[PDB]
Amino acid sequence: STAGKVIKCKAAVLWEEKKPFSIEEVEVAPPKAHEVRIKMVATGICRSDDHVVSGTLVTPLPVIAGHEAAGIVESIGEGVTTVRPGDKVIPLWTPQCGKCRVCKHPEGNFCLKNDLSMPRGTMQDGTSRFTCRGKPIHHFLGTSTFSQYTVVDEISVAKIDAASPLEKVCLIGCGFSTGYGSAVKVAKVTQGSTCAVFGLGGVGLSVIMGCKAAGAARIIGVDINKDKFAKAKEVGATECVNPQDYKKPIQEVLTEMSNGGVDFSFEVIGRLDTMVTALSCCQEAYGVSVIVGVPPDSQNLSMNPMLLLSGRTWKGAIFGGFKSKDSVPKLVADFMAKKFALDPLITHVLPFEKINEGFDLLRSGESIRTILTF
Amino acid sequence: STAGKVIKCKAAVLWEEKKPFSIEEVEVAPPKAHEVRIKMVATGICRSDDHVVSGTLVTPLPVIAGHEAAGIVESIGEGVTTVRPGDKVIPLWTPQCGKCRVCKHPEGNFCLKNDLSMPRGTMQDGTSRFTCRGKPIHHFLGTSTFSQYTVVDEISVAKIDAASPLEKVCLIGCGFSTGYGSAVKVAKVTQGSTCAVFGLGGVGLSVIMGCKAAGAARIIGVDINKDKFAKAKEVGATECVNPQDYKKPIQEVLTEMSNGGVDFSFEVIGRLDTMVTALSCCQEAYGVSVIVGVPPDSQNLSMNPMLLLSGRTWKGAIFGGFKSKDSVPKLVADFMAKKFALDPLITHVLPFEKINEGFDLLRSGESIRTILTF
Numbered sequence: 001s002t003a004g005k006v007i008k009c010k011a012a013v014l015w016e017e018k019k020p021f022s023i024e025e026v027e028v029a030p031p032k033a034h035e036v037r038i039k040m041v042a043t044g045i046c047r048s049d050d051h052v053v054s055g056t057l058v059t060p061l062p063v064i065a066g067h068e069a070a071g072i073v074e075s076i077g078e079g080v081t082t083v084r085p086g087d088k089v090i091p092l093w094t095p096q097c098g099k100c101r102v103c104k105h106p107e108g109n110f111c112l113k114n115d116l117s118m119p120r121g122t123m124q125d126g127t128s129r130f131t132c133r134g135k136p137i138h139h140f141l142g143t144s145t146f147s148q149y150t151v152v153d154e155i156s157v158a159k160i161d162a163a164s165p166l167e168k169v170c171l172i173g174c175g176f177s178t179g180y181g182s183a184v185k186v187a188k189v190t191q192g193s194t195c196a197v198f199g200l201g202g203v204g205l206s207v208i209m210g211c212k213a214a215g216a217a218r219i220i221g222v223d224i225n226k227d228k229f230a231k232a233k234e235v236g237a238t239e240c241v242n243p244q245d246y247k248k249p250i251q252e253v254l255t256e257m258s259n260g261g262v263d264f265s266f267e268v269i270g271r272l273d274t275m276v277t278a279l280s281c282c283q284e285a286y287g288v289s290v291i292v293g294v295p296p297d298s299q300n301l302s303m304n305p306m307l308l309l310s311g312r313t314w315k316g317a318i319f320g321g322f323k324s325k326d327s328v329p330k331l332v333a334d335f336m337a338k339k340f341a342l343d344p345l346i347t348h349v350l351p352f353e354k355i356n357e358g359f360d361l362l363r364s365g366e367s368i369r370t371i372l373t374f
Numbered sequence: 375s376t377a378g379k380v381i382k383c384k385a386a387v388l389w390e391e392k393k394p395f396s397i398e399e400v401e402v403a404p405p406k407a408h409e410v411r412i413k414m415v416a417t418g419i420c421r422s423d424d425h426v427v428s429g430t431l432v433t434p435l436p437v438i439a440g441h442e443a444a445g446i447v448e449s450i451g452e453g454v455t456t457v458r459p460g461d462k463v464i465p466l467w468t469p470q471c472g473k474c475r476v477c478k479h480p481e482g483n484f485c486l487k488n489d490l491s492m493p494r495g496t497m498q499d500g501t502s503r504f505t506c507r508g509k510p511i512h513h514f515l516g517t518s519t520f521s522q523y524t525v526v527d528e529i530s531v532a533k534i535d536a537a538s539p540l541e542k543v544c545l546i547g548c549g550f551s552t553g554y555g556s557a558v559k560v561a562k563v564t565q566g567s568t569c570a571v572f573g574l575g576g577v578g579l580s581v582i583m584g585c586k587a588a589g590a591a592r593i594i595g596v597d598i599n600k601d602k603f604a605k606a607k608e609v610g611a612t613e614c615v616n617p618q619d620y621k622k623p624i625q626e627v628l629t630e631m632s633n634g635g636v637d638f639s640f641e642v643i644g645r646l647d648t649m650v651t652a653l654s655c656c657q658e659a660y661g662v663s664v665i666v667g668v669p670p671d672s673q674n675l676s677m678n679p680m681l682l683l684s685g686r687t688w689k690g691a692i693f694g695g696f697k698s699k700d701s702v703p704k705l706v707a708d709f710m711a712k713k714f715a716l717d718p719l720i721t722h723v724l725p726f727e728k729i730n731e732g733f734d735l736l737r738s739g740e741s742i743r744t745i746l747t748f
């Protein structure tokens with residue numbers, strides 16, 4: 001048995017920014033009250049994990065990153081009621097405490113217990129469950145899925161269908177749900193509309209999936225890497241454009257293509273310039289633009305507020321606007337009922353031991369999602 | 375009769391920025407096809423008219439400003455079907471052509487025929503109906519209501535109730551409708567919500583009216599002129615705050631007062647800094663901020679897009695989001711049925727000849743709306 005004991009297991013530790021992960025033994029403490037220890041089965045490589053490496057996203061180091069994953073409960077602490085040992089689970093990097101004003105709001109999902117705004121890199125109790133070479137190691141977004149075992153707070157885990165293929169549904173833990181919900185829940189894309197999606201990685205492809213599910217008539221994919229266009233069209237893009245191919249700014253091109261601006265635009269990259277371009281290319285009186293990309297730490301954009309005064313709506317969202325614990329099980333059930341596809345997002349499946357190779361595939365432009373299998 | 379003839383009348387001509395208006399004779403051409411010549415009865419002094427003087431809102435000079443008004447049709451050009459001589463009318467500085475993609479959209483109102491985005495200071499046909507000292511004079515927003523007579527395109531006028539008191543309902547031509555619609559239509563303020571209104575002039579007071587009509591539980595007025603607070607409370611503010619009284623930035627004060635951020639905020643001033651402050655003070659996950667104030671020409675704001683990524687919605691609107699020709703007659707009918715009050719906005723009445731004194735009253739901080747009578 002491992003229950004009640006420290007587990008020594010393999011994890012990918014990030015000791016400092018801009019260095020490879022170190023795949024080595026860590027100690028994982030047993031769960032305390034209202035905590036859950038999970039044996040990980042699969043984890044995806046999201047660009048946001050790379051943001052930790054690159055210093056785009058600031059969180060305390062050293063750290064066990066990883067937030068898009070699925071696994072099986074190994075043990076539960078005192079007082080846990082929502083999962084049991086043996087359950088398939090998805091960690092929730094946006095928690096759902098159920099008690100804060102955001103969790104009680106019909107349209108809020110960015111629970112005040114999150115560790116994204118002001119990252120501490122701990123459990124809810126302000127401590128860590130991880131040790132490596134005798135040193136405490138930080139958590140990441142309450143999840144830390146680049147480990148054979150993690151410990152999460154109960155509000156940071158959802159039970160999912162026991163028959164779930166974990167090597168696919170791990171994507172519901174971040175990239176699929178974020179993109180799909182950004183289209184269907186946050187933007188509320190309408191039937192017959194014209195959409196523009198900036199960035200055709202895993203999250204942007206999921207935005208396209210959502211725009212197509214919502215009945216958009218036109219879905220224009222925008223990326224500087226034309227190698228991304230074929231898969232974008234497979235999942236619903238009607239046109240793709242590469243800004244590098246044009247003498248004019250792409251907002252002008254997209255305004256012309258849409259006969260005066262798009263209904264819905266999405267920034268799914270993480271650049272200040274494309275956030276302003278994406279806003280500008282939606283129709284000035286009734287267009288909606290959604291920021292999905294994580295911006296570089298502490299940098300401000302510049303924009304003319306007449307873009308808003310005319311009638312545009314600008315919003316952003318975490319995790320596609322989904323209340324995480326309510327939504328993740330339902331999304332898995334919908335995947336099991338063939339309501340959407342995840343295979344188009346998966347370009348590579350590697351053992352966990354190849355985490356660094358998986359990140360190199362992302363950084364080279366060659367992958368959408370690599371799934372790492374423990 | 376005057377039909378088909380040039381009318382010589384008095385108007386308030388602005389020859390130069392930062393100078394008093396010149397009340398002097400102009401020649402007003404008769405209406406061409408699909409044009410309407412109006413004998414003006416009352417016009418309000420909106421801060422946006424002062425923006426023309428200050429160069430905050432750039433439009434070609436020399437100009438006849440004025441856009442918040444009511445009058446009586448003197449004559450109609452060929453093909454006009456929607457008004458007749460003798461009808462009471464409100465000029466529409468946001469037109470409603472009924473034919474463009476915005477007019478056809480369920481939620482758009484910033485008709486593509488507007489003269490606000492890129493002002494030319496003409497009629498729709500690119501020409502002027504005004505001569506002064508033998509020189510052509512620009513129109514303003516297609517309305518030019520600071521004149522005993524104006525000529526407007528048919529898409530820039532609405533017929534209103536024959537029994538309307540024009541010295542009151544002129545406010546439906548800009549400040550009332552803008553503020554009230556910004557709350558009820560654009561923000562869609564909810565029952566029991568907390569609202570923050572930045573700027574307690576005629577437009578901000580009308581925002582408060584709308585927030586109260588929508589059932590807000592708390593309406594916090596924000597102004598650096600504490601003399602504005604008493605009337606704000608009369609029309610529905612529950613608290614007023616002066617940023618100058620506080621050591622901390624007012625976004626932090628309002629976040630504390632609202633136990634984590636307001637539901638709805640409104641910028642009703644026209645400053646870049648208060649547009650960002652108003653966004654920041656709405657709750658980070660589900661708050662909504664609406665820009666109403668006109669920004670200084672060609673200037674960009676700076677902001678951190680993490681304010682949006684967490685879940686905030688930022689939008690702006692023209693004319694309270696109302697489709698102008700559909701909405702103005704209904705707002706007049708509702709006024710006549712006592713569904714809202716206009717008298718709280720009217721602090722001063724002057725004859726048209728005292729227009730410069732009316733602008734002095736606005737600039738000193740003393741007035742809300744001065745109504746000028748022809």
Ligand SMILES: NC(=O)c1ccc[n+]([C@@H]2O[C@H](COP(=O)([O-])OP(=O)([O-])OC[C@H]3O[C@@H](n4cnc5c(N)[nH+]cnc54)[C@H](O)[C@@H]3O)[C@@H](O)[C@H]2O)c1
Pocket residue numbers: 046047048051174175178198199200201202203204222223224225228243268269270271274291292293294295317318319320365368683
């Ligand atoms: N809001 C959230 O909850 C949330 C969740 C998940 C991911 N994210 C962020 O979303 C973004 C996309 O993540 P991902 O899909 O995993 O990343 P990704 O797979 O790296 O995809 C990004 C895409 O953007 C393309 N690109 C880069 N620069 C430009 C440019 N100038 N113009 C057009 N295209 C360009 C690039 O070629 C690539 O295909 C990242 O910033 C993530 O951090 C946010």
Ligand SMILES: NC(=O)c1ccc[n+]([C@@H]2O[C@H](COP(=O)([O-])OP(=O)([O-])OC[C@H]3O[C@@H](n4cnc5c(N)[nH+]cnc54)[C@H](O)[C@@H]3O)[C@@H](O)[C@H]2O)c1
Pocket residue numbers: 309420421422425548549552572573574575576577578596597598599602617642643644645648665666667668669691692693694742
């Ligand atoms: N979007 C539209 O369709 C539309 C329509 C009408 C008016 N406007 C604009 O709305 C704004 C308000 O117009 P109005 O009510 O006639 O003007 P106003 O009567 O000048 O009211 C503005 C108020 O802002 C207050 N104020 C100034 N600076 C600050 C500050 N730093 N912090 C807090 N309060 C401050 C000021 O004391 C005054 O009471 C102006 O910019 C207009 O141009 C826009």
Ligand SMILES: [Zn+2]
Pocket residue numbers: 095096097098099100101102103111112113
């Ligand atoms: Zn919560």
Ligand SMILES: [Zn+2]
Pocket residue numbers: 046047048049067068174175
């Ligand atoms: Zn992610």
Ligand SMILES: [Zn+2]
Pocket residue numbers: 469470471472473474475476477485486487
């Ligand atoms: Zn129109």
Ligand SMILES: [Zn+2]
Pocket residue numbers: 420421422423441442548549
């Ligand atoms: Zn106005």
